[PDB]
Amino acid sequence: MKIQMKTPLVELDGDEMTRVLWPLIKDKLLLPFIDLQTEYYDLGIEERDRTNDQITIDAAEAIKKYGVGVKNATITPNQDRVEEYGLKEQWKSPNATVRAMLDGTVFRKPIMVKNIKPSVRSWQKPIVVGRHAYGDFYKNAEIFAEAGGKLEIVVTDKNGKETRQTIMEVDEPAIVQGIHNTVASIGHFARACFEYSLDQKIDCWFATKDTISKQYDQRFKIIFEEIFAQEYKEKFAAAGIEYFYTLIDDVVARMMKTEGGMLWACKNYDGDVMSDMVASAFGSLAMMSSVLVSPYGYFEYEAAHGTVQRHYYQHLKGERTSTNPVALIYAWTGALRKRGELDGTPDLCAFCDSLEAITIECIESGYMTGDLARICEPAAIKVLDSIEFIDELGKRLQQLN
Amino acid sequence: MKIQMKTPLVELDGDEMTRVLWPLIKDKLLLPFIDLQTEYYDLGIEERDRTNDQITIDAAEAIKKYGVGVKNATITPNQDRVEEYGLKEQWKSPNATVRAMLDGTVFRKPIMVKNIKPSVRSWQKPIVVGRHAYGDFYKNAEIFAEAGGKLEIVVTDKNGKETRQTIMEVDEPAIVQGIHNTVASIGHFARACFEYSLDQKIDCWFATKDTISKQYDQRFKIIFEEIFAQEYKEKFAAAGIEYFYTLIDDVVARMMKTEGGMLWACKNYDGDVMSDMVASAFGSLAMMSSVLVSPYGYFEYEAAHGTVQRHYYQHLKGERTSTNPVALIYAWTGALRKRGELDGTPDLCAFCDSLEAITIECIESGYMTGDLARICEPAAIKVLDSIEFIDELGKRLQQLNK
Ligand SMILES: [Mg+2]
């Protein structure tokens, strides 16, 4: 029989080329081997528009209920997209929405192949970015103060005690931004990072600009230091690993020189930008896994890249594309593995191990999409289009099973 | 004999190892050749402490008066530094104070040598970072809301009208930050970058996260777009160069694959971090120049790196150090060159071009500090300690009969 699942995955569909490839993955790589159970939520742009973005919230609720989600790449619509699709508004990033609702830390890890050298000469070991998923400027308040004025932040507690601080007082057109985070969210971030480091036996590096931000960034620094001292110090020393804190400018300068091999903990914004820099440098944003690990027990595996508009238009014209589906594949395998772990269904986990291994073997053997063929050494034997590539992996799986 | 100056440079001294090397540069590389005129401001941590940080303000005022400053590396003190030096308080970043007082854009360019390949394989051409010098979180207001509450930004105008926006309402301990910028400062930032791109004949790339920050970052995007359309589109076309706007995560991915050769315009924070990433990748933080170009006509050249506490402590024990003084040197040559341009004293500019060239040629001939010798190819001929390095450049200057 096919591999059986005890609990369904929550499945969040997406946009454009990634939407096109998603059912081909299911058809060729999963359904022939697994009696795949999912709760399906279409987060394509048109369905988010139809439902006034309720579908996004509903999907996040389902992840909370079942425990594990898999997410396809989506469009966060700018005004071009609004015009292209005739949208009601510039709907908020669905990633930002899910992360807000679930909380946690997003772990981003390169999917490494031996035949692609990183951009950064020194890198010999993967660098994992642990990005705080919650708060900061992903939930902002902003004012365009067209006549200027006294610009303040204000906090009013339960009890009515008001605290005010002045940003600046200006007599000219100005812009203002406010952000927050929570002590609890930061603590869970620190914990997730330290636990990841211990599990994987890698050092943890964290950095902020605590010299400039003497209460906000300072609070991250203190919380990591205290959690580390009180909960992890001994565990780390027994495991032969270290926690290193520095300033953000110093850590980035080090990253250009390091051999790699650590967990790089980042505040939300830093992690968003830096995970993309690391992904690119190792080879591709499609060669990078992404998992949100919530302290509340939820997991969301996603393809953390664009939807490939140019390739989608080509596809609709009957042209084959060089789209790299690896991140999409690893979102499914990561999610099915976790679901299998939680459910105590190890045949599912073993399948996921196999498909991941097959994907790497295929690329390392010189059979790959065009983006990878551009940067590998030695030269690829054969460039496979996105659909041929998926078809090839399906043939390898059939030969296993 | 010695080259004459018309107008003094404003000289801002600093801390630790950089403070140690600063007179050696003057003594062996400047004073023998130039009747150096400076107005001296000691921004060492102890003078800042003694004057309650007034000396920083006074120095910024002297830059406004004379037009050009040269700044040594300084400590921005955390509580560890407070303890170390017995300070009254964690004095605010003097760089932030100076930038706030002058406004402008900080241009950060690698100091490239033929025998050092960049960390990023694709880079074949310099990348300049143009960092907006004003506002954002460098002038923050922050609250530790130990009881939570309604967290807001509030704008109270000249005429009454209160505008409030809610960040979040929480029932748990939380932290709150507010920042600002001005439309005028942003515009001056866009113009400085467009002018720099024209003058250097290089493309301009700018990026934010306007998809998430739909008024704040968006206002940067808009101001750039409008200034470019109104004031630079035709000039760019004429010069064969482009302005490219994208999202910040996209630009960083591109930076790992580009050949280089553009001006990368950055918001204040992005510029702080990304100028150091570019500097490190090209070779060292010490191999990066830094000039604040104010819209009000002032210039501040600095050594934009650390003060090297560990080396300082070794130096006090009479031990040799591997501190790289090139950025200190280039701060001086850059400031003196500008001083000479403004004063119409071209012999000073000539000397500055010569000292930069001599420094480059020293390193390219295999004589360099430890940091460079770790990454150069072929192997260094002789690794010089910081002071041996300055002394070598001195020897060369004298050999060339400057
Ligand atoms: Mg810096």
A58 part of contact set with chain B, CB < 8 Å: no
A4 with A35: CB under 8 angstroms?
yes
A272 in a known ligand binding site: yes
Cβ atoms within 10 A of the Cβ of A375, count?
16
Cα–Cα distance for residue pair B227/A352, rounded to 1 Å: 53
Q: Say how many residues make up chain B.
A: 402
8 A C-beta contact, residue B274 and residue B97: no
* SS percent in chain A: helix, strand, coil, step 5: 45, 20, 30
Element (H, E) at A17: helix A16-25
Spatial contact of A15 and A44, defined as CB atoms under 8 Å apart: yes
CB atoms within 10 A of CB B222: 14
Identify the residue whose tokens are 């067209």.
A146
Strand partners, B128: B263
Nearest CB neighbour to B212, from listed A138, A150, A170? A138
Angstrom CA distances, A237 to A103, A130, A259, A263, A291, stand at 29, 21, 21, 16, 27
Instruction: List the 317-376 stretch of A: residues with Cβ below 8 A of B.
Output: none
Q: How far is the CA of B313 from the centre of ligand 1 (A)?
A: 22
Q: Which residues of B are annotated as a binding site?
A: 74-76, 81, 93-99, 108, 131, 138, 209, 249, 254, 257, 272, 276, 305-311, 324
Tell me how many degrees the CA angle B236-B239-B245 measures, rounded to the nearest 5. 35
SS3 A26: helix
Instruction: Tell me the C-alpha distance between A319 and A64, whole Å.
Output: 39
The full 3-state SS of chain B, as one line of letters, equals CCEECCCCEEEEECCHHHHHHHHHHHHHHHCCCEECCEEEEECCHHHHHHCCCHHHHHHHHHHHHHCEEEECCCCCCCHHHHHHHCCCCCCCCHHHHHHHHHCCEEEEEECCCCCCCCCECCCCCCCEEEEECCCHHHHCEEEEECCCEEEEEEEECCCCCEEEEEEEEECCCEEEEEEEEEHHHHHHHHHHHHHHHHHHCCCEEEEECCCCCCCHHHHHHHHHHHHHHHHHHHHHHHHCCCEEEEEHHHHHHHHCCCCCCCEEEECHHHHHHHHHHHHHHHCCCCCEEEEEECCCCCEEEECCCCCCHHHHHHHHCCCCCCCCCHHHHHHHHHHHHHHHHHHCCHHHHHHHHHHHHHHHHHHHCCEECHHHHCCCCCCCCEECCHHHHHHHHHHHHHHCCC
In chain A, the residue whose alpha carbon lies closest to the alpha carbon of B120 is A120
Q: Which of chain A's residues have a Cβ under 8 Å away from the Cβ of B121?
A: 117, 119-121
As a whole number of angstroms, the distance between CA A271 and CA A276 comes to 8
Q: Count of CB atoms within 10 A of residue B226's CB?
A: 12
Q: What is the amino acid identity at position B261?
A: G
Tokens of A351: 């399948």
- Find residue A151's DSSP bridge partners: A168, B155
Q: For residue B167, give how far its alpha carbon lies from the nearest alpha carbon of chain A (Å).
A: 5
Q: In sequence order, what E strands does A75-173 have?
A: 105-110, 128-132, 141-145, 149-156, 162-170
CA distance A164 to chain B (A): 8
Residue A119 burial (C-beta neighbours within 10 Å; 0-12, 13-18, 19+): buried
- Give me the residue label for tokens 């900061």: A136
CA distance A250 to B279: 11
Q: Residue A253: which of B182, B184, B277 has the nearest Cβ?
A: B277
Using a CB–CB cutoff of 8 Å, tell me whether B79 touches chain A: no
Nearest-angstrom CA–CA distance, A70 and B134: 42
DSSP class of A230: I
Q: List the domain range (segments joined by +) for residue A352.
A: 1-401
**Are A282 and A108 spatial neighbours (Cβ–Cβ below 8 Å)?**
no
Helix/strand/coil for A236: helix
How many other β-carbons are positioned within 10 Å of the β-carbon of residue A395? 12
For chain B, the C-alpha Rg in angstroms (whole number) is 22
Residue A244 CA to residue A263 CA, distance in Å, equals: 10
A106 three-class SS? strand
Q: What are phi and psi of B42, to 5 degrees?
A: -85, 95
Residues of A within 8 A of B257 (CB-CB) are 119, 280
* Number of helical (H) and strand (E) elements in chain A, helices listed first: 15, 16
Question: Helix, strand or coil for residue A194?
Answer: helix
Query: CB of A70 within 8 A of CB of A301?
Result: yes
Backbone angles phi, psi at A303, to 5 degrees: -90, 100
DSSP state of A51: T
Contact between B81 and B87 under an 8 Å Cβ cutoff? The reply is yes
What distance in Å separates the CA atoms of residue A22 and residue A315, rounded to the nearest whole number? Answer: 14
B243 - beta bridge partners? Answer: B204
Cα dihedral across residues B386, B387, B388, B394: positive or negative:
positive
Q: Measure A207 CA to ligand 1 centroid, in angstroms.
A: 13
Q: How far is the CA of B77 from the centre of ligand 1 (A)?
A: 14
Q: What is the DSSP letter of A3?
A: B
Resolution in A: 1.8
| Number of domains present in the structure of chain A | 1
Question: What are the binding residues of B for NADP(+)?
Answer: 74-76, 81, 254, 257, 305-311, 324
Q: What's the CA gap between A61 and B348, in Å, rounded?
A: 69
Dist. CA B269–CA A126, nearest whole Å: 27
Q: Is A239 on the interface with B (CB under 8 A)?
A: no
Q: Chain A partners of B254 at a C-beta cutoff of 8 Å?
A: 280
Contact A311, A17 (CB under 8 A): yes
The H or E element spanning position A206 is: strand A204-208
Residue in chain B closest to A140 (alpha carbons) equals: B167
Distances (CA, A) of A96 to A56, A184, A195, A243, A372: 10, 19, 24, 28, 29
Q: What angle do CA B105, B108, B113 make, to 5 degrees?
A: 160
Cβ–Cβ contact B165 with A under 8 A: yes
Which chain A residues have a beta carbon less than 8 Å from that of B252?
Answer: 273-274, 276-277, 280
The residue among A359, A354, A357, A370 whose CA lies nearest residue A393 is A359
Which alpha helices (H) appear in A110-267, and where do they start and end? 183-200, 216-227, 233-239, 248-255
Instruction: Please indicate if any CB of chain A lies within 8 Å of the CB of B124.
Output: no
Mutate to test the interface with B, among A117, A129, A144, A177 (most CBs of B within 10 A): A177
* Rounded Cα–Cα distance for residues B243 and B192 (Å): 13
| Separation between Cα atoms, residue B320 and residue B340, nearest integer Å | 35
Using H for helix, E for strand and C for coil, what is the string for A263-293? EEEECHHHHHHHHHHHHHHHCCCCCEEEEEE
Lookup result for tokens 């939300």 = A268
CB-based contacts of B248, cutoff 8 Å, min separation 6: A273, B207, B208, B209, B270
Q: Which burial class, exposed, middle or buried, applies to A377 when counting CB atoms under 10 A from its CB (0-12, 13-18, 19+)?
A: exposed
Structure tokens at B391: 């002394």
CA of A249 to the centre of ligand 1 (A): 5
Specify whether the CB–CB gap between A291 and A332 falls below 8 A. no
Task: Report how far ligand 1's centroid is from the alpha carbon of B385 (Å).
Answer: 24
Burial class of residue A116, CB neighbours in 10 A (0-12, 13-18, 19+): buried
Query: Which residue of A180, A256, A276 is in closest CB contact with B167?
Result: A180
Three-state DSSP state, A107: strand
Rounded to 5°, the CA angle B150-B153-B156 comes to: 125
Residue B147 CB burial class (10 angstroms; 0-12, 13-18, ≥19): middle
Backbone torsion region of residue A350, taken as left when φ is above 0, otherwise alpha when ψ lies between -120 and 50, otherwise beta: alpha
Q: Structure tokens of A295?
A: 């302290």
Q: Among residues B10, B99, B22, which one has the least CA distance to residue B342?
A: B10
Q: Which amino acid is at B187?
A: G
Structure-token pair, residue A85? 């699709």
Cα B314 → chain centroid? 27
Q: How far apart, in Å, are the Cα atoms of B74 and each of B18, B27, B144, B207, B285? A: 8, 21, 28, 30, 15
Residue A142 and residue B122: Cβ atoms within 8 Å? no
Measured between CB atoms, which of A121, A122, A149 is closest to B158?
A149
Give distance in angstroms: CA of A120 to centre of ligand 1: 20
Q: Directed axis angle between helix B346-364 and helix B326-343, to 10°? A: 160
Taken in order A266, A268, A274, A279, the sign of the CA dihedral is positive
Partner A contacted by B138 (CB < 8 A): yes
CA distances from A225 to A191, A231, A263, B84 (A): 11, 10, 16, 20
- Tokens representing A298 are 């939820």
CATH number at residue B329: 3.40.718.10
Shortest CA distance to B137 belongs to which of B177, B185, B174, B82? B177
Nearest to B279 by CA among B291, B270, B290, B287: B287
| Contact call for A141 and B150, based on CB within 8 A | no
Chain CA centroid to CA A25, Å = 20
Given the structure tokens 């902020």, which residue do they identify? Answer: A208
Instruction: Inform me whether the C-beta atom of residue B377 falls under 8 Å from chain A C-beta atoms.
Output: no
Q: What 8-state DSSP symbol labels residue A109?
A: E
* Strand-pair category, B299-302 with B288-293: antiparallel
User: In Å, how far are A23, A75, A322 from A17, measured between CA atoms?
Assistant: 11, 11, 11
Count of other CB atoms within 10 angstroms of residue B113: 19
Q: Which two tokens stand for residue B27?
A: 């003594």
Q: Which residues on adjacent β-strands are paired with residue B203?
A: none
Q: Bridge-partner residues for B359, per DSSP? A: none
Distances (CA, A) of A353 to A67, A334, A340, B197, B316: 21, 9, 12, 50, 58
DSSP 8-state assignment for residue A138: G
Q: Which positions 277-306 of B are in contact with A (Cβ < 8 Å)?
A: 277, 279-281, 285
CA distances in angstroms from A311 to A11, A17, A78, A323, A328, listed in the order given: 23, 6, 19, 7, 15
How many residues in total does chain A contain?
A: 401
Phi, psi of B255 (to 5 degrees): -60, -25
Whether the Cβ atoms of residue B163 and residue B152 lie closer than 8 Å to each other = no
| Residues 6 or more apart whose Cβ sits within 8 Å of residue B78 | A210, A211, B90
Of A152, A182, A212, the CB nearest to B96: A212
Amino acid at B216: Y
Whether A138 and B253 lie within 8 Å, measured CB to CB: no
Residues β-bridged to residue B288: B110
A183 inside 8 A of chain B by CB: yes
Spatial CA neighbour of A289 closest among A132, A129, A111:
A111
| φ and ψ at residue A220, rounded to 5 degrees | -60, -50
Q: Kind and range of the H or E element at A300?
A: strand A299-302
Residue B8 CB neighbour total at 10 angstroms: 16
Contacts of A218 (CB under 8 A, 6+ apart): A208, A210
Q: What is the DSSP letter of A116?
A: B
Distances (CA, A) of A230 to A49, A201, A203, B150: 47, 19, 17, 31
Phi, psi for residue A330 in degrees, rounded to 5? -70, -20
CB contact set of A249 (below 8 Å; sequence gap of 6+): A209, B272, B273, B276
Determine phi and psi for B292, rounding to 5 degrees.
-85, 125
> With contact defined as beta carbons under 8 Å apart, do B130 and B106 qualify?
yes
